[PDB]
């Protein structure tokens, strides 16, 4: 084979349709389904799989008590077939760690996992299922990464890493990897002030990443990466439509080179597709908590600070629970453009439901279409009562 090259553009997005759904929590009521969190989706040339961080126990077991924690070090990155539940008998382990990212470059897969204490943390980069290279911690405070699919171009796969206070000016680095080796890295530049958990997609040469600002605002930062040059810039999405959670109620005028205030020290991972008049933004529906999920069509959201929605689609009702979301694309599909897709984590259990001692999620995913299709919401559908 050869490496994937990001030469096609993005398809016109008129509406979204169901791509996949595992119903992991419903199934897990009476089967050996693993407790997971922080899912993402990724596709190889002939297969799509779900990825998630496992807590090392089934939902129904007794070790699910206390899985609310983000790291226990019993945590690992696993992968299982699209729309099947993450069961104990069908999952493959990619690597071990409490934070991760992965992707396929056209020849093989790269996976990165971060493990260890909050101080002496470390990252191990795997390629073709073997460890290749490692990165130690530099700011000594929770080394962390994307929790999403990475995007490669001609073998080069840029990855965003953060190290430092989550309520302060943490540092940031971008590493450029090839076959698991480190070719270069850069300190973060541009006007974004704080970056965590980037969601990236490639298009017509170049990678766009939507990331989160957990320090000062509701206008998510964007990193624009040139994988050939191995250079980058950053800014915020100008649109007055705010996309983080919790967030302020929308203003008339947004901001571009500075975060938009009112909700400090918080936020949720999310995504956007930035393409001029073909621009779409994702966000929760409630401004107070992680519930609901919708897609809005907002022309020129990246640069127009007075732009507003002209269309949209509901994915999850505000009556349902939501979670982290992010983007992905199948870069080996036939056609003259890439079909944009995204996923949403649906969180059940703690911290919102106190009737159980665990936390878990179901996965729902959507892909775009050029047709105008109808809409339906997609609750995880589990009865919490059945676990009580």
């Amino acid at each position: 084979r050869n490496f994937n090259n990001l030469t096609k553009g993005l398809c016109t997005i008129n509406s979204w349709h169901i791509y996949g759904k595992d119903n992991a929590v419903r199934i897990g009521e009476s089967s050996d389904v693993l407790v997971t969190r922080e899912p993402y989706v990724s596709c190889d040339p002939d297969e799509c799989r779900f990825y998630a961080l496992s807590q090392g126990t089934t939902i129904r077991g007794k070790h699910s008590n206390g899985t609310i924690h983000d790291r226990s070090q019993y945590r690992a990155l696993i992968s299982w077939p699209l729309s099947s539940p993450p069961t104990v008998y069908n999952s493959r382990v990619e690597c071990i760690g409490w934070s991760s990212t992965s992707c396929h470059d056209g020849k093989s897969r790269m996976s990165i996992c971060i493990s260890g204490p909050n101080n002496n943390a470390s990252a191990v980069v795997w390629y073709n299922r073997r460890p290749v290279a490692e990165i130690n911690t530099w700011a000594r405070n929770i080394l962390r990464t994307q929790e999403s699919e990475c995007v490669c171009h001609n073998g080069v796969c840029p990855v965003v890493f953060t190290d430092g206070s989550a309520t302060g000016p943490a540092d940031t680095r971008i590493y450029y990897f090839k076959e698991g080796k480190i070719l270069k890295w850069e300190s973060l530049t541009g006007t974004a002030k704080h970056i965590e958990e980037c969601s990236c997609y490639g298009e017509r040469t170049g990678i766009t990443c939507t990331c989160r600002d957990n320090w000062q605002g509701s206008n998510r930062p964007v990193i624009q990466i040139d994988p050939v040059a191995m250079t980058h810039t950053s800014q915020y999405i100008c649109s007055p439509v705010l996309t983080d959670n919790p967030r302020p109620n929308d203003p008339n005028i947004g901001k571009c080179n500075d975060p938009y205030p009112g909700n400090n020290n918080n936020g949720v991972k999310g995504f956007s597709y930035l393409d001029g008049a073909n621009t779409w933004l994702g966000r929760t529906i409630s401004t107070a908590s992680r519930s609901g999920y919708e897609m809005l069509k907002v022309p020129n959201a990246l640069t127009d600070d007075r732009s507003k929605p002209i269309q949209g689609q509901t994915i999850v009702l505000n009556a349902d629970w939501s979670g982290y979301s992010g983007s992905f694309m199948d870069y080996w599909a036939e056609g003259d453009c890439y079909r944009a897709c995204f996923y949403v984590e649906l969180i059940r259990g703690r911290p919102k439901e106190d009737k159980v001692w665990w936390t878990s999620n179901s996965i729902v995913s959507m892909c775009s279409s050029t047709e105008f299709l109808g809409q339906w919401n997609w609750p995880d559908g589990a009865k919490i009562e059945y676990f009580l």
Epitope: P251, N252, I253, G254, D258, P261, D305
Partner: antibody, heavy 120, light 108 residues
């Protein structure tokens, strides 16, 4: 915690100028715009003007032009406004406020306590 | 001259008694209208911006909407603490202007 702190009350005789400070805290000073309003006793809020966050271009209320100037000191995170050639009817409480876009006006959310200036 | 009026200029109501205050712009200012609350001796507080967006920290009892150039602020129940002069601000274009304000007093 975002706060705006203004200079205390002063009394001037007509023809004098007055400079009123407003110190910012809790946020990056240079990222937000500053504006002023004044409230004469028994009156509503009269907009004085608005100064842009990054370049200080300013915009003065027309009825005040020729008597008013605005400036900021980014090293002390302090905004200043000055009126010249004061008259007895310029008695008012002057308030400083912060505006969300720092490059456009859309919603002044933080207010100082107000500075009373008496002209007599 | 960006012109706006308030109506009622004054009113009163018993605590717990729901009220509405209106503002009318001459110009087609669209969504660019904010509402402020001022108590004696204090700098004005914000309640609503961009016509209907509530400011975080402001009680849920406050809400508003607009049609044409007519904007309203209303409440659900009337709080013992919300007797104040309310003002509309036209943020649409400089010079920015305020209406004269509406005073809500306590019914006696």
């Amino acid at each position: 915690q975002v706060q705006l702190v203004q200079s205390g009350a002063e009394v001037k005789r007509p023809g004098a100028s007055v400079k009123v400070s407003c110190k910012a805290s809790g946020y990056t000073f240079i990222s937000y715009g500053i504006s002023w309003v004044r409230q004469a006793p028994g009156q509503g809020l009269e907009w004085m003007g608005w100064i842009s966050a990054y370049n200080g271009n300013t915009n003065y209320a027309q009825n005040l032009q020729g008597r008013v100037t605005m400036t900021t000191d980014t090293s002390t995170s302090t905004a200043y406004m000055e009126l010249r050639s004061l008259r007895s009817d310029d008695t008012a409480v002057y308030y400083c406020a912060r505006v969300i876009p720092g490059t456009a006006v859309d919603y002044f959310d933080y207010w100082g306590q107000g500075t009373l200036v008496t002209v007599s | 001259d960006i012109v706006m009026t308030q109506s009622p200029s004054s009113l009163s109501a018993s605590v717990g008694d729901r009220v509405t205050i209106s503002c009318r712009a001459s110009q087609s200012i669209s969504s660019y209208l904010n509402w402020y609350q001022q108590k004696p001796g204090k700098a004005p507080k914000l309640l609503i911006y961009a016509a209907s967006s509530l400011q975080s920290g402001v009680p849920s009892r406050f809400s508003g909407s607009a049609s044409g150039t007519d904007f309203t602020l209303t409440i659900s129940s009337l709080q013992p603490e919300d007797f104040a002069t309310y003002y509309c601000q036209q943020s649409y274009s400089a010079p920015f202007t305020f209406g004269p304000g509406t005073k809500v007093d306590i019914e006696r």
